[PDB]
Design a protein around this ligand. Structure first.
Ligand SMILES: *[C@@H]1O[C@H](CO[C@@H]2O[C@@H](C)[C@@H](O)[C@@H](O)[C@@H]2O)[C@@H](O[C@@H]2O[C@H](CO)[C@@H](O)[C@H](O)[C@H]2NC(C)=O)[C@H](O)[C@H]1NC(C)=O
Ligand SMILES: *[C@@H]1O[C@H](CO)[C@@H](O)[C@H](O)[C@H]1NC(C)=O
Length: 218
């Protein structure tokens, strides 16, 4: 996240870190005690058997007893287009069920087909790059963003920080976009580099996948 701020510890207990060899590479969202959702491109060219799903984290630089760690048991994708980044969403069943508590909670999702119009206010988040040559964030970052339809396509939810250069960045992919307390997006891609101030950020449109999600996580 470029130009955001530290989240308060465990402010977003649905926030998940996907890790390889003990290192964060993508966000995810806990959507049931034994399922998370992320961006399909996050798991595309990696050994999924080695992926660790880290719940309850805040500071990547610390050992945190609040953490619960799982592995991937099952993978669901529905028409993921790796070239155009269409349907960039994956559901990952975990090898067990999280203990639900203050620091580990399931997210709330929108109704199928629910559309946020140009102009709605949301919150992006993630442990991705803080900026060019600044590396990934130790502490979970969050960022006030605005849903926009300008420079967007129907198959994405797009957001922009109006008036300054800020946005999501590498390592933020897979992370939730929260609008009215509901997860309406999964970070997918930037254009013109991160925080260009020229192109909005693009999210997989969760609300287009709710029936499919419903069919899997129950
Ligand atoms: C920056 O955003 C925060 C939080 O945004 C709200 O909560 C997000 C998780 C998401 O659901 C968004 O769509 C929401 O808009 C704002 O903090 C809220 O501010 C309102 C108005 O003051 C207040 O009633 C709420 O208590 C706050 N919500 C939370 C979760 O703390 C904040 O106002 C935004 N700042 C600006 C200037 O945009
Ligand atoms: C799931 O995998 C993790 C990490 O490899 C392991 O520690 C744990 O035993 C597994 N959990 C369950 C419930 O099988």
């Amino acid at each position: 996240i470029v130009g955001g701020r530290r989240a308060r510890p465990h402010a977003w207990p649905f926030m998940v870190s996907l890790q390889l060899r003990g290192g964060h590479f993508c966000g995810a969202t806990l959507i049931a005690p034994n399922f998370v959702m992320s961006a399909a491109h996050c798991v595309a060219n990696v050994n999924v058997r080695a992926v660790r799903v880290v719940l309850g984290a805040h500071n990547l630089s610390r050992r945190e007893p609040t953490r619960q760690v799982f592995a991937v048991q099952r993978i669901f994708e529905n028409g993921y287009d790796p070239v155009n980044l269409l349907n960039d969403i994956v559901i990952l069943q975990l090898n067990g069920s999280a203990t639900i508590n203050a620091n580990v909670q399931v997210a709330q999702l929108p109704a199928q087909g629910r559309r946020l119009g140009n102009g709605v206010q949301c919150l992006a988040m993630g442990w991705g790059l803080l900026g060019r040559n600044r590396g990934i964030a130790s502490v979970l970052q969050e960022l006030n963003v605005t849903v926009v339809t300008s420079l967007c396509r129907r198959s994405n939810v797009c957001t922009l920080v109006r008036g300054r250069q800020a946005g999501v960045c590498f390592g933020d992919s897979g992370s939730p976009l929260v609008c009215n307390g509901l997860i309406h997006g999964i970070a997918s891609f930037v254009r013109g580099g991160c925080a260009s101030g020229l192109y909005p950020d693009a999210f997989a449109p969760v609300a287009q996948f709710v029936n499919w999600i419903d069919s899997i996580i129950q």
